[PDB]
Symmetry: C5
């Protein structure tokens, strides 16, 4: 055998009982899979690499080059114990075998690589939905060793993160990958070193525009055509307003089907409910006109053209709606 | 080897055949994941720690400090056998390796830590839904050893429970974590000691308000505008009431889609069905008015203005609805 | 070692080549989890215990008391081979270790306990749904040994079944747990002994009442108010009947969404379709009245008050509906 | 030990390097679970048995009877390697242990039994849906050995298939179980022997009748009552036809929700679209009548009873619908 | 033993420390399972075969023919380490045993075969949906060895890919299977050789035609019948247009339920929204006619037949719709 595995006890780390051992980390991201608003999490696939030195794995040679071993030798040597903090589930791919790489140099330097898929939590804010922007991160830490036993750092600084050129999401734009570091404390175990991978997402607005904003505006404009119809056709003007109200209610109900039940109002809700109020007032206007006409007829009868309300509504309603749209799209850009 | 594993039989507990062995327990909660009303359960992730002494694991040293071992040595020594009572499913995280920690002091004291995810049952009461409050707990017990063999207790009393500062639920407010203890009996195996983790949840009401209570009130108010319309427009006043009835029915049907089929009435059902009855009576009022008008016309014909019912309805209906709202929101706060 | 495991061949049962060995069985039920109408199955969690004697496990002592062993010794001795007949899936809980107990007395008596979750088939009859009652059972049998090798029986007769005081289902009432026994034959392997666990379920009716029966009756009563409206308002009386028909159809469609596609009619279907027929006839009545009125007008014209049909309908329709309800609720209680 | 396992190398089949070894197969079917039209597959549970002879498993005795072994001895001997062709997923039940049986006679004959659940593909034709009939099969073959190494056959001919007396499907009738055999070729590995299990399914028609065919016929008949209403009530005759059209469209949309998107028309689609066309023509008839009446009035005005179209429609529409029904139900039986 | 396994160290590849070892690859495709538009992936099942030479597996014989071994010998020898690039999940079938084949010739040539199921990503473009065409591929590469250690190539060139004669998809047409090769680079590990399997899919259009395009055209044509109705029936002409608008909106909402939220418009959306605009303009036309008629009546009153707009609309609307259809079906074929 080229490696003297049987001569050592690999239940103890290199430098056991002494100074801490440094371990470097390098990463390449392969894909971003899915994003859930109800669960508030994301899924990622990536390659994870480790670097350290262990003098028990030294072997003699003349070329001084790395050699590759098959990968079932991993379970017989010491290996770091990284885990993903705040994750829900994860696994290691194993077809047609375990996706594991092991390379050793003659002096004892080791490279160790894995392929994993992780689901991790992300806390999202929906006050500007669907014109919102989110920030998420992934955290890496050792489970068992404190900073007095294992020192964890990025292998090459800022150059330690790479991404695939094919990374894409159908509903979001991805930008600004970078890495950071921070210490963490547990009240009963000690201090640990954490690594972070940060990125930002921006949602696409076109679908929501065409699917939600256009129909509501069309219904609001459809409510205005009743002001131009003769007031003597009562069963021609009542159903138009009633149907507009019902369709607006259906749109409002259908919009919320995909979202969690948060305790605050979103940007699209304001628009939809203002439109609903506009249509409701349009319905009340004709009732006022009809009542006043009947009262006037009775008063003229007891003594033995267009009403002003319609004429004013024809100008007042569109101007108010246009002003609301100006303010709304200035605030939410 | 530093530890003399091969010299002992670890199929027997420490102090086998004698007094019971004490085991202490410490916990840190990482997250609360999901809550299901149809299944009546919750999911939790946490770190679980054990403390005991075993003289077979003693080794010589001079510094008198804990040493950390890699974690594959767990399957060769004796270890406690805790399990979660009344749970549906659970697992131990295992990427990139088993999330396990093992630390031993020179005298033989042991610390053993794990990372687990559990789904557990909780019995919920929905009589005040959606203005309700729930209480749930998680139970820990040994499977095989009775109190004559193993003594289970909280390691530091009330200071044995910690929580993450990021614990959050989108639909609930979390409060009042605390711990208790109680004995349990099985008729064919004996007495056991149980540990409890208790907490309380309060639901957020804003979403339900805006989604359910506002539309029903708007429909009820929309039914009242017919009292102000001339009674000679029969096909203008019938469709308004009919459409209000149908929309109320649709809202009632849509509300129940997310809930289990309990054998009692909930708080929101009372409100919705009272609103439905209000709209139904609004429909019946116009039929009465029309019948009386036709009868009066026939009687006046055989001899050769606003009806009182509308005038009274205009005041009676809103006052009754306001009184109902006052009583309802005083009872359910 | 206290037990002489290495001195025996545990691939053979106790009393190999001779008379059969008796094995007793004891059970405690922990929970009933879910019931599926489309799949026709249920899920159960329980503790399962075995009793037998094996002289190869004898050890010397003075106190004559049971001793508990850690549980990894199970895979080195002989153990029975029970399985669940007619089951779809099952597993054994394994956090934080296998939920297994092993106790041995000095003479060689053994107690062996496990914690399992099972999904099993149950054949349900829905002719009286949703006022129905179902009966289900769970079956236990050895896989490999016939009655000439292994004798299976209940350990203490009728006292061998216990249940948790917290067992509950949100939609059903649980009653009448009991146990039975019966022999089974396979044409190519032989005779086997089976154990049964029987129980009964009764569904709660309140939700179905409030959700389905009340709206249909309200629609049927809403169809009757047209008989009191003047016959000269044709576009006021046609839409009322049409909308009642459409709403009844929607209710009928929504009711069936949760049920399997059986080849017979259920109790609720009869009620819903009779209501639909009532509303359809209500629609036809006004067409008859209108046609007769127009014919009479033409006949009176060519020579140069309330129609009887409405007056009779006002009494005939409610009486028939009340009679149908009396008969229906006498038959289905 | 009764069996001399350690004295042989069980990585080689019986008769290695010589003539092929015969293996017989016997089957009992326990249940048919589910049928998916969108995925076009079915699920089955069954017991699978194997028969062969291996002289390395001979042991001495006097009674000459089969002996049963616990079942963990399977992983130490040679065993056949059957797999299910064209399957999507499958598993072996393992509670409370692996559902495995092993019986050996003193001369070396072996019986080996398993309990499995399989999901397999079936290609379905929906041109006569929902009055259709389907045929499906399950295929069994060895993975690694060609016919020159292993000979696969039915153990007892036609008597090798048994079924449970409780096998049932809620939506189908099951009939005609039988078995066949055929050879298969792979261009790079060789020739193999396949076994088949065939059966037929017939769908139940009652639910589809009551749910789909009756409402469409009722809507078509409801369209005809307008021919008997006076032509001077325009806003009483337009809404009736419009509502019938809309309800027919809703029924058509609701019918297709459960089916895959095939590239041909089904039997129910023809009926629904013919009904839709009938209602559309009913709407056009009144427009023609109204236009002709207005033209006649203008012509009579410029010179200073029932229209024939209604009278003919009253007879022509029902006769055509009855003729269509006769032809349709003669073709599709 | 025929093979001298115990005399060698199989943690090192053949030709360790020297020139690279060639490995050939051959494939037969069994099925294509499912295609997801929201997830943008596909599932495939196939047989995978490897070819190489290892002199450590030589054995003496006279016939010079391949011999088959049981398959548990795989875990004791060296074997290649292929994996699927850009895949989400995969597994190896294992009933009734691992689907693995191992054949060795006396000189040391090896054949090794497996049966696997893979889910892999495919980037789809929906600008021409549902008249679109997609191209997908599957990628095979070694995980641990670079081109200086292992040379990967197609075993027989273009003749290395076979497909089953039963491969079918219900919604797509499959064509043009072929293979390619390309080198790949990782910035921290080196150069690797990749193999590709390419194919093309074309969707079936019949279902979408009958389900979506026909109803929208029918609604558009139904909007035109109002131009032929007398303008004095206001509550007969308003509801027709309103109902057409609402039904068009429902169709548009129902179409999008199955698709991802892309940031561009699809082919079917253009058609549906143009139809919606047509119906909206149809509604506005009658409002214009009514307003002009009322104004003319007032003007004629103050001094003390068919309107031109309807007559022109009857020709202008159908011609514009026909022209739009011509252009649309010329562009999208
Ligand atoms: C056309 C529509 C949506 C569809 C109807 O509701 C009408 C509004 C009018 C205002 C528009 C808006 C789409 C989004 C716009 C173009 C805004 C943006 O630049 C977005 O970043 C500024 C003004 C906005
Ligand atoms: C506005 C709305 C809901 C929307 C319509 O139904 C009208 C009611 C009127 C009474 C309101 C209620 C919302 C909840 C309120 C504010 C109660 C609370 O403090 C809740 O803790 C007291 C009075 C309640
Ligand atoms: C109120 C309602 C349901 C809601 C409307 O359909 C009207 C019926 C009238 C008859 C009622 C029935 C509910 C169930 C009752 C009370 C029966 C039972 O004791 C049930 O065990 C006997 C009479 C039944
Ligand atoms: C009653 C209904 C369905 C409900 C309405 O559409 C009217 C048709 C009329 C023709 C009937 C059909 C049901 C199926 C029948 C009875 C056919 C069969 O024996 C079926 O095998 C022959 C004639 C068919
Ligand atoms: C009948 C229908 C769909 C249903 C209504 O919208 C009317 C159009 C009219 C134009 C037709 C189209 C179906 C697809 C056709 C036949 C095109 C194709 O050869 C497709 O490759 C050319 C013209 C197209
Ligand atoms: C790639 C690399 O670093 N190679 C070096 C080589 O240059 C040096 O001569 C040798 C001596 O041990 O060590 C190794
Ligand atoms: C942290 C701790 O308790 N350290 C003690 C140390 O103070 C003491 O001198 C030694 C003697 O055995 O035991 C250990
Ligand atoms: C609990 C029990 O049965 N204990 C008995 C004990 O009474 C008896 O003296 C002893 C002699 O072997 O056997 C044991
Ligand atoms: C069931 C059966 O076949 N039993 C036979 C038995 O009749 C025969 O005497 C014996 C001799 O080896 O072989 C065995
Ligand atoms: C199938 C095949 O290639 N068979 C050959 C055989 O023709 C040759 O005589 C023998 C000598 O070693 O090698 C082998
Ligand atoms: C990347 O690292 C460099 C060097 O430490 C630092 O100056 C820079 O701010 C980092 N970039 C980001 C985006 O954090
Ligand atoms: C916590 O423990 C202390 C000490 O036993 C006890 O007094 C106190 O009531 C406990 N708190 C709760 C909330 O149970
Ligand atoms: C319980 O067992 C006893 C004794 O065998 C028997 O008499 C009784 O009928 C059983 N009870 C039931 C409910 O089967
Ligand atoms: C069953 O097998 C017999 C004997 O080979 C054969 O004659 C018969 O046709 C088979 N039955 C069927 C239904 O295939
Ligand atoms: C198949 O391989 C041959 C030989 O290399 C090549 O000429 C041909 O273009 C290939 N076919 C395809 C479709 O790539
Ligand atoms: C009826 C729609 C009115 C739209 C008014 C235009 C809004 C433009 C806002 C631009 C702010 C940047
Ligand atoms: C039409 C809505 C009437 C709402 C009446 C106000 C209810 C306030 C109740 C306050 C009780 C604390
Ligand atoms: C309109 C509802 C009529 C309900 C008639 C009462 C039915 C009571 C049946 C009691 C039988 C036990
Ligand atoms: C309006 C429904 C007409 C139904 C006509 C009867 C069809 C019977 C067909 C019998 C063919 C075997
Ligand atoms: C109302 C439907 C009009 C359809 C006009 C025919 C379109 C044919 C386009 C052929 C282009 C190849
Ligand atoms: C809901 C009340 C409407 C009142 C309308 C009366 C206009 C003066
Ligand atoms: C459903 C019956 C309505 C009766 C209305 C008659 C008013 C006197
Ligand atoms: C001259 C026709 C007036 C119609 C205006 C409609 C505005 C929505
Ligand atoms: C809609 C407001 C009209 C005001 C008339 C004085
Ligand atoms: C709605 C009640 C009116 C009472 C008239 C006497
Ligand atoms: C509804 C039946 C009326 C009978 C009139 C003679
Ligand atoms: C519906 C066709 C009527 C024919 C009148 C000549
Ligand atoms: C619809 C356009 C009509 C033009 C009349 C001048």
């Amino acid at each position: 055998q080229l490696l003297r595995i049987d001569d050592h006890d690999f239940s103890m780390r290199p430098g056991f009982g002494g100074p801490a051992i440094p371990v470097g980390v390098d990463v390449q991201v392969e894909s971003l899979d899915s994003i859930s608003e109800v669960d508030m999490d994301f899924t990622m696939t990536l390659y994870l690499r480790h670097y350290w030195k262990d003098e028990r794995l030294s072997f003699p040679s003349t070329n001084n080059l790395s050699m590759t071993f098959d990968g079932r030798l991993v379970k017989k040597i010491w290996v770091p114990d990284m885990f993903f903090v705040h994750s829900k589930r994860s696994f290691i791919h194993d077809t047609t075998t375990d996706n594991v790489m092991l390379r050793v140099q003659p002096d004892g330097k080791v490279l160790y690589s894995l392929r994993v898929t992780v689901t991790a939590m992300c806390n999202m804010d929906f006050s500007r939905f669907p014109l919102d922007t989110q920030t998420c991160s992934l955290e890496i830490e050792s489970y068992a060793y404190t900073e007095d036993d294992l020192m964890l750092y990025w292998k090459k600084g800022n150059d330690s993160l790479k991404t695939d050129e094919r990374i894409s999401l159908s509903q979001f734009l991805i930008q600004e990958f970078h890495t950071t570091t921070k210490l963490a404390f547990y009240s009963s175990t000690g201090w640990y070193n954490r690594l972070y991978i940060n990125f930002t997402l921006r949602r696409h607005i076109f679908f929501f525009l065409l699917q939600t904003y256009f129909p509501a505006t069309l219904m609001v404009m459809l409510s205005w055509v009743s002001f131009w119809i003769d007031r003597r056709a009562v069963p021609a003007r009542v159903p138009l307003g009633i149907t507009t109200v019902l369709t607006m209610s259906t749109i409002i109900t259908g919009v919320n089907a995909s979202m969690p039940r948060v305790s605050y109002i979103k940007a699209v809700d304001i628009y939809l409910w203002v439109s609903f109020v506009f249509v409701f007032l349009s319905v009340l206007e004709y009732a006022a006109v009809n009542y006043l006409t009947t009262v006037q007829e009775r008063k003229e009868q007891k003594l033995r053209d267009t009403h002003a309300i319609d004429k004013y509504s024809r100008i007042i309603f569109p101007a108010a709606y246009i002003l609301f749209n100006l303010i709304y799209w200035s605030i939410f850009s």
